[PDB]
């Protein structure tokens, strides 16, 4: 009565969207209905392919008259399983409701029942010993063939639930539905375009509909092509309807589609705004103002990002894959940490020293199904999904097991990684920077001879031995970090002094340092083999240590006004220690 | 949260599958965006299309209160959806939406809120706002591909340091009255 709904009647009022194409599938389903045996068609397919539209769309064609004469007069009903169980409180209610519906169908012999998600009725209502399964009640009728019903199910549901019911499976004839091609999908949108256009009072451009089917499939990989494109089309109409005044956008241009596909896919958009162009162009000194030297390393990072945003980038590979090798204390990791801050994107750090063992890979991709750690999930996959546009940092990659390197081969070459749950992580927009310490022993080593030789070439051999040629063929560039020069150290000292000032500013103390004092600290702490890290120790013992005693128990509690100068006579620093 | 709420309003103005899903980490204001949408509507700082609309919060615990007999949940849940379709201007907010995926199964049945709402979300008859964490969305919600397709995942990102101080300033009048104290400009920073 009210549980079902005559889809044919619904089509007369425009309640079912029109069908486009799918002639081969419709003919197959119609043929399965006419045959004397196995008269019950089934539509196995993936989510979004359009299997539900084919069952409901069949009614739209019947009312239109573009169907065979045999199938010209047939009522199509849609079974709402929820309505069947609405008032099924007392015993025998399910039997009367279900049997009453079947009686009307068998007597007519023309009416056909469409049951979406037929796997649901396999476990229909049973309370106490009744065992009144909807499948068992309808099983005898399907065997004889008096009534024919259409079904819809997913591949998983058809195998996990429907395949178990062998009796129902034999009667039903599986029809496989596959997502149409890009050329076929654009025709579907053209047929559905008037309905969406009327709702939003807009007009989609013929070029724009094509870009929706191409941009979505390229970036959006979590849904099938027919629904995926429609989502972009439908959402683009709403964005144009919400314009500020008088609905300025009366047509949906290709630019609108690109903006809709960028936000949906959590990727940077095309035609970068002037705000982003300023920071991109200005990213020539900001990195050089914090990380002095290693200009070629900064250029590779900034060029790869500029190329990706400009539109010239790898189809399926990341924006950039780099291997940062060199001596200790160089800004291999600082340039990466300071890159995310300059761009204003999340920084994903992964100390690879924890993955020394081969079995430790389970925390990256996730444990297999049915294990204690399956619920926790992967750390790399989840982080990438949460922040697709981010700077990944695999520090101390050399310590990791060689098996971990194999995981990165797919990331660099394909940009898609499969986790335990099956979700595909997108590495197209994520930057890959892995700092390695291989060959550092040879760098600080001194040759057995009068003249010390350069071990840079020997260090590279260790990097080529640990990393197989496959790993080195997928990296965009290998940037060896050169040692810090004397003049560069002077800039590093200023950087650490600035940090000291910021720390003292919180406490309310100022700090003035003469230029001669800075040069003394540089030459004292300068060590080409130890990098810039020793410079922080000199600052700690010469500047932070005296101030700490005065700050805690001394005159420099507030006000500051500290001054630092070096007397050439004693060759030692002089601390003002003004109470202020 | 103008960008976040604008995308949500855009999804809610779609023809089909107009069911946004506020997916984000705990503490990023997921419930605030959905619950605050109602506060904005009453205040009046919302697009005209969203005005005159009523947002309702669903308590899944109250639906299953007295569902001892068969069909009490189905009739109770189905009746609720009819009210939304009648006015055709009401939105449903289901916090912790991952829970409804399996709720309502009595012994071995697949009839649940997911299947009961599924045919009504793909047709656009009703609008439902969801909110769930990444872990729950990836491990539970993502398993149901059919339900996930109907819901448009709207990602929520943690705000910056500057964006947080303005939020506290807006919330400060509510916390000051509770404790009858005052906060300084430096204390918030």
């Amino acid at each position: 009565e009210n549980f079902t709904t005559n889809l044919n009647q619904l089509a007369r009022v425009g309640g079912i969207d029109p069908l486009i194409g799918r002639e081969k599938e419709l003919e197959r389903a119609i043929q399965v209905l006419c045959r004397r045996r196995k008269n019950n068609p089934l539509l196995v397919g993936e989510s979004g392919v359009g299997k539900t539209a084919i069952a409901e769309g069949l009614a739209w064609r019947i009312v239109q008259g573009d169907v065979p004469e045999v199938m010209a007069d047939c009522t199509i009903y849609s079974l709402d399983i929820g309505s069947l169980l609405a008032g099924t409180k007392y015993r025998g209610d399910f039997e009367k409701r279900f049997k009453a519906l079947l009686k009307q169908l068998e007597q007519d012999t023309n009416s056909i029942l469409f049951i979406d998600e037929i796997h649901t009725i396999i476990g229909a209502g049973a309370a106490s010993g009744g065992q009144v399964d909807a499948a068992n009640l309808i099983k005898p009728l399907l065997s004889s063939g008096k009534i024919r019903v259409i079904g819809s199910t997913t591949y998983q549901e058809f195998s996990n639930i429907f395949e178990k019911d062998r009796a129902l499976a034999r009667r039903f004839q599986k029809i496989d539905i596959t997502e149409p091609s890009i050329e076929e999908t654009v025709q579907i949108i053209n047929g559905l375009k008037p309905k969406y256009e009327a709702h939003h009072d807009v007009r989609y451009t013929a070029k724009a509909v094509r870009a929706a089917v191409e941009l979505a499939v390229k970036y959006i990989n979590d849904r099938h092509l027919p629904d995926k494109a429609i989502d972009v089309i439908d959402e683009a109409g709403a964005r144009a309807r919400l314009m500020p005044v008088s609905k300025r956008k009366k047509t949906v241009n290709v630019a609108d589609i690109e903006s809709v596909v960028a936000r949906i896919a959590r990727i940077p958009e095309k035609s970068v705004s002037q705000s982003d162009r300023d920071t991109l162009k200005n990213l020539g000194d900001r990195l050089k103002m914090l990380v002095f030297g290693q200009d070629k390393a900064i250029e590779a990072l900034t060029e790869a990002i500029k190329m990706a945003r400009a539109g010239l980038g790898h189809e399926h590979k990341p924006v950039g894959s780099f291997l940062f090798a060199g001596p200790t204390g160089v800004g291999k990791t600082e340039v990466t940490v300071q890159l995310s801050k300059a761009l204003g994107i999340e920084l994903l750090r992964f100390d690879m020293s924890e993955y020394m063992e081969r079995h430790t890979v389970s925390r990256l991709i996730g444990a297999p199904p049915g294990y204690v750690g399956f619920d926790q999930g992967g750390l790399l996959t989840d982080a990438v999904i949460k922040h697709p546009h981010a700077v990944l940092l695999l520090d101390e990659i050399e310590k990791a097991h060689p098996d971990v390197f194999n995981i990165l081969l797919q990331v660099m070459d394909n940009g898609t990684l499969t986790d335990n749950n099956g979700r595909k992580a997108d590495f197209r927009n994520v930057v890959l920077v892995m700092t390695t310490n291989a060959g550092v022993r040879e760098t600080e080593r001194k040759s057995i001879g009068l003249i010390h030789q350069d071990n840079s070439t020997d260090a590279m051999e260790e990097i080529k031995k640990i990393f197989t040629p496959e790993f080195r063929n997928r990296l965009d560039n290998i940037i060896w970090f050169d040692h810090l020069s004397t003049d560069v150290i002077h800039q590093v000292v200023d950087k650490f002094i600035v940090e000291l000032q910021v720390q003292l500013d919180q406490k309310g103390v100022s700090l003035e340092v003469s230029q001669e004092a800075r040069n003394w600290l540089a030459e004292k702490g300068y060590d080409r083999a130890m990098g810039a890290r020793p410079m922080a120790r000199v600052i700690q013992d010469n500047l932070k240590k005296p101030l700490a005693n005065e700050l805690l128990f001394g005159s420099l509690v507030d006000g500051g006004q500290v001054t630092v100068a070096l007397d050439k006579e004693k060759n030692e620093l002089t601390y003002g220690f003004q109470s202020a | 949260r103008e960008k976040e709420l604008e995308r949500a309003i855009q999804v809610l103005c779609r023809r089909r599958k107009n069911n946004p899903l506020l997916v984000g980490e705990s503490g990023v204001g997921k419930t605030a965006i959905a619950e605050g949408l109602a506060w904005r509507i009453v205040q009046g700082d919302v697009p005209e299309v969203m005005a005159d609309c009523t947002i309702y919060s669903l308590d899944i615990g109250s639906l299953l209160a007295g569902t001892k007999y068969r069909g009490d949940f189905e009739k109770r849940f189905k009746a609720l959806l009819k009210q939304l379709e009648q006015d055709t201007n009401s939105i449903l907010f289901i916090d912790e939406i991952h829970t409804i995926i399996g709720a309502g199964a009595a012994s071995g049945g697949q009839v649940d809120a997911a299947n009961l709402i599924k045919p009504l979300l793909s047709s656009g008859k009703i609008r439902v706002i969801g909110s769930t964490t990444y872990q729950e969305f990836s491990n539970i919600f993502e398993k149901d591909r059919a339900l996930a397709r109907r819901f448009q995942k709207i990602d929520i990102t943690e705000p910056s340091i500057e964006e947080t101080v303005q939020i506290i300033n807006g919330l400060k009048p509510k916390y000051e009255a509770h404790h009858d104290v005052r906060y300084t400009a430096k204390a918030v920073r």
């Binding site: 099924t88 409180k89 007392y90 015993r91 209610d93 209502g125 309370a127 106490s128 009744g130 063992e357 079995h359 049915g370 294990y371 204690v372 | 001892k68 007999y69 068969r70 199964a105 009595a106 012994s107 071995g108």
Partner: peptide, 25 residues
């Protein structure tokens, strides 16, 4: 030194099912 051997741990799965009631009259 001989290579190490790792042993996996499989978790069993068992769940409880509710029961709906139907009054006769």
């Amino acid at each position: 030194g001989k290579t190490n051997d790792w042993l996996d741990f499989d978790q069993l799965a068992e769940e409880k099912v509710r029961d709906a009631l139907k009054p006769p009259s």
